[PDB]
């Protein structure tokens, strides 16, 4: 099924021809366009007062990464390296060894935030909810080196943002 967007014959009777002549000489369609921009002048603008107001986001928002803990404070990450395997950008680098208590834990967990594409595949792959993309998006830096996160940086993000991260996961985990 189709329709023609521009297949019409103008009426060539004198009244129609004078209507087109009046439009040409008196600029009527142009005046109508001015009415439209005038109507917008008196409309309330759509601008929000950043940073005092913020754009709406949802619990699924993919922002700055962070490493999480169990309620006891033990790390959730068990160095399975599934995040590192799935990462489309190869932005994750991991090393691990048996910890002094025999636990399976990482000794390196780096995310190159300038390789990362913020796709969220790592938090989908993680079997224990250790690596997440948090809700923060206001972490621009003055140097490139500040965006090469190591494990310390990522654990601090987890301790910094856990209150919000736990609430967001609560809101969306039944969709996962």
């Amino acid at each position: 099924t189709y329709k023609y967007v521009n297949l019409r014959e103008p009426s060539m009777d004198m009244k129609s021809v004078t209507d087109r002549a009046a439009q040409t000489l008196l600029w009527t369609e142009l005046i109508r366009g001015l009415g439209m921009t005038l109507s917008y002048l008196f409309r309330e603008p759509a601008t929000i007062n950043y940073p005092f107001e913020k754009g709406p986001l949802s619990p699924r928002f993919r922002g700055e990464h962070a490493l999480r803990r169990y309620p006891s404070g033990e790390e959730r990450c068990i160095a399975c390296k599934l995040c590192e395997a799935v990462c489309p950008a190869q932005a994750i680098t991991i090393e691990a060894e048996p910890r002094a208590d025999g636990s399976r834990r990482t000794t390196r967990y780096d995310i190159d935030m300038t390789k990362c594409i913020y796709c969220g595949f790592c938090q989908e792959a993680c079997p224990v909810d250790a690596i997440v993309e948090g809700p923060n998006f206001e972490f621009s830096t003055e140097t490139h080196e500040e965006l090469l996160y190591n494990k310390e940086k990522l654990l601090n993000n987890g301790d910094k943002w856990e209150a919000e991260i736990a609430a967001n996961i609560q809101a969306d985990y039944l969709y996962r």
């Binding site: 489309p88 594409i117 796709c119 595949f121």
Partner: protein, 70 residues
């Protein structure tokens, strides 16, 4: 024939005679990033996000085309 040397970024090499355009020669590759080669080092899931970044105005349509093929 006056020669002029100049969505993304484009380089147009044009030949004009007065107001008219005799020849338009688009010089592209300014955003060539070897996506097709990079996909050969990805799993099928790992390749999917590359399709968001082709026509990066129609992201999920590009996703759909790749998904249907797979």
């Amino acid at each position: 024939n006056l020669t002029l040397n100049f969505h993304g970024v484009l380089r147009l090499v044009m030949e004009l005679s007065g107001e008219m355009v005799r020849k338009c020669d688009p010089h592209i590759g300014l955003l060539h990033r070897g996506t097709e080669k990079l996909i050969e080092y990805k799993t099928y899931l790992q390749a999917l996000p590359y399709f968001d970044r082709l026509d990066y105005v129609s992201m999920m349509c590009n996703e759909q085309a790749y998904s249907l093929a797979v």
